[PDB]
Symmetry: C4
Subunit: 88 residues, 4 copies
């Protein structure tokens, strides 16, 4: 699907931005930065929190911007891929 | 859009109320109070929990009143604003 | 509203059940048990986790049963109360 | 219902996969592995985070694949089963 493709690409770019930011500013390992971005944007959350004020401000903006996109991608993956394969 | 503007203003006022409350009652720094309000209303959560009973009661009420508004704002941002990707 | 009334009553009974359970089995203070039930059923989550296996099993069942009801109540409070008052 | 049964079976299989994985890779007790899978897929979250990189990668993928199915099961339970309250 085309819109699923654009949602996938935007989700990947968002997770890449989060990885880069949290590895630079918060000094996380790249895998830890990626995990934090993922559990944050899916609203799972973890015991980790940003320590710098820049990290906290960016996390607020990142949450507000990326929750909608990550969950649009999850919803489209569920409704246009997972449902037909289940029907099979 | 107008409804988007109402939702933005209400979200800002809700986060301001949360910031003021958690900086007064829970003694958090204002940036920390804002971060806690944001991660609470978006259901992300963090390792911080209110220590006073007043903080806990206010958080229960704050969750129930503000989750709907915050996620309405996120949805309207993602749909009525976050679609310039249609310029694909 | 009638269905809003039944959703409110069911949410109150669910939070009461959670308060009683987590104050007895997990030894929490009643306010702490109520706060844990609230942040759990709204998927906010907190740093607290049940220590007993009974608490963990009950929490799994409680999550699955009460997320749908708590969020039906939140959705109805947003759509049948908050929206018209906003329009005013 | 039949779709409810498919969703229940898929949810059980997903939680079983999560239990097995988190008990092997992360060394959790089986009850703890099941609890972590449940609170992760429902987006509640807990103070536990995977310690191995394999655990983190698997959790990212597990979140993205299972959130849709788990919440479809919760919705179908709450709507097609949790309405005997209509006997009001
Ligand atoms: Ba959620
Ligand atoms: Ba948490
Ligand atoms: Rb959540
Ligand atoms: Rb959470």
């Amino acid at each position: 699907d085309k819109e699923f493709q654009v949602l996938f690409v935007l989700t990947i770019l968002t997770l890449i931005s989060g990885t880069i930011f949290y590895s630079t500013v918060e000094g996380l390992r790249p895998i830890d930065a990626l995990y934090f971005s993922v559990v944050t944007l899916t609203t799972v959350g973890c015991d980790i929190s940003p320590q710098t004020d820049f990290g906290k401000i960016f996390t607020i903006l990142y949450i507000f911007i990326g929750i909608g996109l990550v969950f649009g991608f999850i919803h489209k993956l569920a409704v246009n891929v997972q449902l037909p394969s289940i029907l099979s």
